[PDB]
C-alpha cells in the first residue's frame, strides 16, 4: 500500500521524542510487527499495539522538506512539523517559518545581521508571499492592509515567557518607525522601550518555571495621522494576576 | 501455444502430471513470457487451491481462459525506459542493478552479476542500455 | 477577569489581527541549540499542532499546473500530453488518483487532500518499479528457451 | 477569617489602582498633540500555561487563550473562503471547528466560574463542596469535563 520496503517512518524515542526508521520488509496486512533500522544500522522489530492495530507516522519525501511554509508538507503531523523546523533552524540558521497565516519565531539566543536598514528596505512595499518569512513581512502587511481597507490593525504576539515576544514587538515598531516619515523629537520607539523596565517591575514576576514572567496582557497602540506617519502611542493593560 | 511434447519434457516421471510450481517454467518453455504475478493469478482463479500437481488438460484450460493476457507476452520486441531522462542512452550500473534487483519481481544479485559478465562499462560507470537489452534478448 | 477579557476581545474585534507565535527551543539559553522535548511542549501549548491538525482535514497541499507538470511529465503516456498544459494535468491526475473527492481543480492551482502528493511520489517510484518487471520477464523467457 | 479576606481585598484593590495610575502617567509621555486617524496595536500576551499542579491562575490563563483561539479560528475560516473564491472552488467544503462549548463550560451560568462565585457567597462553602457541585452539575452531562 504505502508501507513498502525502503519507505521511512517515525517511531517514539525517550531521547529525541521521535526517531527515524526504515522498513526492512513490506508490511503485510494483519502482521503483528514491523522490521526496522535505526541510526546505527539494522537492528529492531517494532511491535504494533493490538487494541488499535495502528501504524507509526510516515516521513515526507525529501523534495518537500525545508520549505518556507509547513502546510506544503503532504504528511502533516507532529514529527513532520518538528523535523522540518529543526533542519531550518540548525542546518540553515533560519528562525522564521510560516504555518499558513501564522509566523513561527524560534529564539536563536545569538544576534543576527537580519534586522538592519538594508533588509528593512528590501521588505518595504513587497507582498508577504514573495519574500522570505520575517517579523518585518508581518509588519509590512499590517501597514498595507491599514490604508487598503481604512482599518486599524492588531499584531498578536504569543508564546511562553522568554520565547522572545518582547524582542518581536521591538522590531515590528522599528519597521513602522522607519517606513513612515519619522517624527523629530518624538522618535516614538525610544520612549516606548524605556517604558518596559517600569511595566516589568509592576507586571512581571518570578514563577516556578520562569525567572521573569508577565502576569498580564500589554497592548501598545501605535498612532498614525491622515498622511500615515508615526505620531504617538497608547498603552492598554488587561488580565492582571491580582 | 499448447504443446504436449513440451509438457512431456516437464513430466519427467511419466505420471502425467507436473508440479504446480513448475507452471511458470512450462509456460516459458512453450513460448510465453508471463510475470510470476500473472502465473499466480492464473492458478488462483481456479480452485486448484489444494492441487499439488497439474495434468496437461488442466494446463490447457488455463491457457485457453487466459490466452489474451498470455499472448500479450509475446508481442513486445523493443523496450524503453524512464530511467535516463537526459537521453544520454546510458545508465549507471548502480541504477541498472537497482531496477533489476530492488524493483518489481526482483532478480537475485547472482543473476544480475551473470548478465553483466562481458558487458562493457565506461569510466563514468555507465552501460549502453540499448546494446545491453539487445544482447540479453537477441541471443 | 471575565470583564477584562470581554473588553480585550471587543478592542481586538474592531481590527484585523496578525499572528506571531514565539518558541523557546532550549532551556539553558544556548545559541542555535534545539531540544525536541522542549520544542514539542512549546508547540502543543501554543495551538500550533492543533491548528495544523485542522488544516490537514481539508485541502492543504497546493501546486500550480506548471509545477505539477514539471515533476510528473514522466508519469504521462506520450500521447496524453496536449498543447494545453493545464488540461493535460486534468486528464493525467484523473487516471493516477481515482477517487475524485481527493482533489479539486482551481483557476491557477490544484488543491490536494493530505497524503496525496506523497502518493504521487509513491506512484512515481512504483512506475520505475513496474518498468523492471516488464524487462525481467522478457529476459527470463529468452534464457529459458536457450536452456 | 473575614478580617483577613478584607485586608487582602484592600491590598489587592490599592495595587490595581496604583498599577492603573502608572499606566495613565506613562501614557502622558507617549501621547501626541497631533490628531490620530488610525492605529496598529501590538498585543504581548501569554499562551496555554500547564504545570504539574494547576490552579486558578492557570485556569484563568487558559480561559483567555480559548477566547483568543476562537477569534483566530474564525479569521482563518474567512481567509480560506477568500482564497477558495479566488480559484472558483465550492466554498462549502471547509469544516469549521467550533470551541464555543468549552468557552460556555467555563463562563456560562451553571459553568465552572459561576458555581465558584456561588460557593463563595455561601458562609459554609469549601473547595470540596464546590468540587462535588461541579461533578453533580457537569460530570457525564458534558464530554469536555472529566474527573
Swiss-Prot record, chain A:
<feature type="binding site">
    <location>
        <begin position="159"/>
        <end position="166"/>
    </location>
    <ligand>
        <name>ATP</name>
    </ligand>
</feature>
<protein>
    <recommendedName>
        <fullName>Unconventional myosin-Va</fullName>
    </recommendedName>
</protein>
<comment type="subunit">
    <text>May be a homodimer, which associates with multiple calmodulin or myosin light chains.</text>
</comment>
<comment type="function">
    <text>Processive actin-based motor that can move in large steps approximating the 36-nm pseudo-repeat of the actin filament. Can hydrolyze ATP in the presence of actin, which is essential for its function as a motor protein. Involved in melanosome transport. Also mediates the transport of vesicles to the plasma membrane. May also be required for some polarization process involved in dendrite formation.</text>
</comment>
<feature type="domain" description="Myosin N-terminal SH3-like">
    <location>
        <begin position="4"/>
        <end position="56"/>
    </location>
</feature>
<comment type="similarity">
    <text>Belongs to the TRAFAC class myosin-kinesin ATPase superfamily. Myosin family.</text>
</comment>
From Swiss-Prot, chain B:
<dbReference type="GO" id="GO:0044325">
    <property type="term" value="F:transmembrane transporter binding"/>
</dbReference>
<dbReference type="GO" id="GO:0097225">
    <property type="term" value="C:sperm midpiece"/>
</dbReference>
<dbReference type="GO" id="GO:0010880">
    <property type="term" value="P:regulation of release of sequestered calcium ion into cytosol by sarcoplasmic reticulum"/>
</dbReference>
<dbReference type="GO" id="GO:0031800">
    <property type="term" value="F:type 3 metabotropic glutamate receptor binding"/>
</dbReference>
<feature type="modified residue" description="N6-acetyllysine; alternate">
    <location>
        <position position="12"/>
    </location>
</feature>
<dbReference type="GO" id="GO:0090151">
    <property type="term" value="P:establishment of protein localization to mitochondrial membrane"/>
</dbReference>
<feature type="modified residue" description="Phosphotyrosine">
    <location>
        <position position="129"/>
    </location>
</feature>
<feature type="binding site">
    <location>
        <position position="95"/>
    </location>
    <ligand>
        <name>Ca(2+) 3</name>
    </ligand>
</feature>
<feature type="binding site">
    <location>
        <position position="120"/>
    </location>
    <ligand>
        <name>Ca(2+) 4</name>
    </ligand>
</feature>
<feature type="binding site">
    <location>
        <position position="49"/>
    </location>
    <ligand>
        <name>Ca(2+) 2</name>
    </ligand>
</feature>
<dbReference type="GO" id="GO:0140056">
    <property type="term" value="P:organelle localization by membrane tethering"/>
</dbReference>
<dbReference type="GO" id="GO:0060315">
    <property type="term" value="P:negative regulation of ryanodine-sensitive calcium-release channel activity"/>
</dbReference>
<keyword id="KW-0966">Cell projection</keyword>
<dbReference type="GO" id="GO:0005813">
    <property type="term" value="C:centrosome"/>
</dbReference>
<dbReference type="GO" id="GO:0019904">
    <property type="term" value="F:protein domain specific binding"/>
</dbReference>
Curated annotation (Swiss-Prot), chain D:
<protein>
    <recommendedName>
        <fullName>Unconventional myosin-Va</fullName>
    </recommendedName>
</protein>
<comment type="similarity">
    <text>Belongs to the TRAFAC class myosin-kinesin ATPase superfamily. Myosin family.</text>
</comment>
<comment type="subunit">
    <text>May be a homodimer, which associates with multiple calmodulin or myosin light chains.</text>
</comment>
<comment type="function">
    <text>Processive actin-based motor that can move in large steps approximating the 36-nm pseudo-repeat of the actin filament. Can hydrolyze ATP in the presence of actin, which is essential for its function as a motor protein. Involved in melanosome transport. Also mediates the transport of vesicles to the plasma membrane. May also be required for some polarization process involved in dendrite formation.</text>
</comment>
Amino acid at each position: 500500500e504505502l508501507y513498502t520496503k525502503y519507505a521511512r517512518v517515525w517511531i517514539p524515542d525517550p531521547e529525541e521524542v521521535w526517531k527515524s526508521a526504515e522498513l526492512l520488509k513490506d508490511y503485510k496486512p494483519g502482521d503483528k510487527v514491523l522490521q526496522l533500522r535505526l541510526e546505527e544500522g539494522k537492528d529492531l522489530e517494532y511491535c504494533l499495539d493490538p487494541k488499535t492495530k495502528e501504524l507509526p507516522p510516515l516521513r515526507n519525501p525529501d523534495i518537500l522538506v525545508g520549505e518556507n511554509d509547513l502546510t506544503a508538507l503532504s504528511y502533516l503531523h507532529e514529527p513532520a512539523v518538528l523535523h522540518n523546523l529543526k533542519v531550518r533552524f540548525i542546518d540553515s540558521k533560519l528562525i522564521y517559518t510560516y504555518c499558513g497565516i501564522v509566523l513561527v519565531a524560534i529564539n536563536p539566543y545569538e544576534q543576527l545581521p537580519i534586522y538592519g536598514e538594508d533588509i528593512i528596505n528590501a521588505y518595504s512595499g513587497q507582498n508577504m508571499g514573495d519574500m522570505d518569512p520575517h517579523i518585518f513581512a508581518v509588519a509590512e502587511e499590517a501597514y498595507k492592509q491599514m490604508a487598503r481597507d481604512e482599518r486599524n490593525q492588531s499584531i498578536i504576539v504569543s508564546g511562553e515567557s522568554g520565547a522572545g515576544k518582547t524582542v518581536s514587538a521591538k522590531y515590528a515598531m522599528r519597521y513602522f518607525a522607519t517606513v513612515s516619515g519619522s517624527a523629530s523629537e518624538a522618535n516614538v520607539e525610544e520612549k516606548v522601550l524605556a517604558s518596559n523596565p517600569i511595566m516589568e517591575s509592576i507586571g512581571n514576576a518570578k514563577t516556578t518555571r520562569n525567572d521573569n514572567s508577565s502576569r498580564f496582557g500589554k497592548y501598545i497602540e501605535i498612532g498614525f495621522d491622515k498622511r500615515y506617519r508615526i505620531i504617538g502611542a497608547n498603552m492598554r493593560t488587561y488580565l492582571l494576576e491580582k | 501455444a499448447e504443446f504436449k511434447e513440451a509438457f512431456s519434457l516437464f513430466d519427467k516421471d511419466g505420471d502425467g502430471t507436473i508440479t504446480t510450481k513448475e507452471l511458470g517454467t512450462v509456460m516459458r518453455s512453450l513460448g510465453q513470457n508471463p510475470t510470476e504475478a500473472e502465473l499466480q493469478d492464473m492458478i488462483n482463479e481456479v480452485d486448484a487451491d489444494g492441487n499439488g500437481t497439474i495434468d496437461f488438460p488442466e494446463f490447457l484450460t488455463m491457457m485457453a481462459r487466459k490466452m489474451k493476457d498470455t499472448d500479450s507476452e509475446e508481442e513486445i520486441r523493443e523496450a524503453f525506459r524512464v530511467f535516463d531522462k537526459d537521453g544520454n542512452g546510458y545508465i549507471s550500473a548502480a541504477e541498472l542493478r537497482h531496477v533489476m534487483t530492488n524493483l518489481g519481481e526482483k532478480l537475485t544479485d547472482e543473476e544480475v552479476d551473470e548478465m553483466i559478465r562481458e558487458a562493457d562499462i565506461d569510466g563514468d560507470g555507465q552501460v549502453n542500455y540499448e546494446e545491453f537489452v539487445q544482447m540479453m534478448t537477441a541471443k | 477577569f471575565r470583564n477584562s477579557l470581554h473588553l480585550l476581545m471587543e478592542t481586538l474585534n474592531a481590527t484585523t489581527p496578525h499572528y506571531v507565535r514565539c518558541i523557546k527551543p532550549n532551556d539553558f539559553k544556548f545559541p542555535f541549540t534545539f531540544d525536541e522535548k522542549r520544542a514539542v511542549q512549546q508547540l502543543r501549548a501554543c495551538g500550533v499542532l492543533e491548528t495544523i491538525r485542522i488544516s490537514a482535514a481539508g485541502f492543504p497541499s497546493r501546486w500550480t499546473y506548471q509545477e505539477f507538470f514539471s515533476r510528473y511529465r514522466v508519469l504521462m503516456k506520450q500521447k496524453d500530453v496536449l498543447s494545453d498544459r493545464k488540461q493535460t494535468c486534468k486528464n493525467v491526475l484523473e487516471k493516477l488518483i481515482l477517487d475524485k473527492d481527493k482533489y479539486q481543480f482551481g483557476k491557477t492551482k490544484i488543491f490536494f487532500r493530505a497524503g496525496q502528493v506523497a502518493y504521487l511520489e509513491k506512484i512515481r517510484a512504483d512506475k520505475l518499479r513496474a518498468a523492471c518487471i516488464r524487462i525481467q520477464k522478457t529476459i527470463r523467457g529468452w534464457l529459458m528457451r536457450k536452456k | 477569617l473575614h478580617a483577613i479576606n478584607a485586608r487582602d481585598a484592600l491590598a489587592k484593590h490599592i495595587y490595581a489602582n496604583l498599577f492603573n495610575w502608572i499606566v495613565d502617567h506613562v501614557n502622558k509621555a507617549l501621547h501626541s498633540t497631533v490628531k490620530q486617524h488610525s492605529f496598529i496595536g501590538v498585543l504581548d500576551i501569554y499562551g496555554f500555561e500547564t504545570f504539574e499542579i494547576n490552579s486558578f491562575e492557570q485556569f484563568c490563563i487558559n480561559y483567555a487563550n480559548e477566547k483568543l483561539q476562537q477569534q483566530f479560528n474564525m479569521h482563518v475560516f474567512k481567509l480560506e473562503q477568500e482564497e477558495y473564491m479566488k480559484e472558483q472552488i465550492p466554498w462549502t467544503l471547509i469544516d469549521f471547528y467550533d470551541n464555543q462549548p468549552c468557552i460556555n463550560l467555563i463562563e456560562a451560568k451553571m459553568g465552572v466560574l459561576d458555581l465558584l462565585d456561588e460557593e463563595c457567597k455561601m458562609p459554609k462553602g469549601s473547595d470540596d463542596t464546590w468540587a462535588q457541585k461541579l461533578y453533580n452539575t457537569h460530570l457525564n452531562k458534558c464530554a469536555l469535563f472529566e474527573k
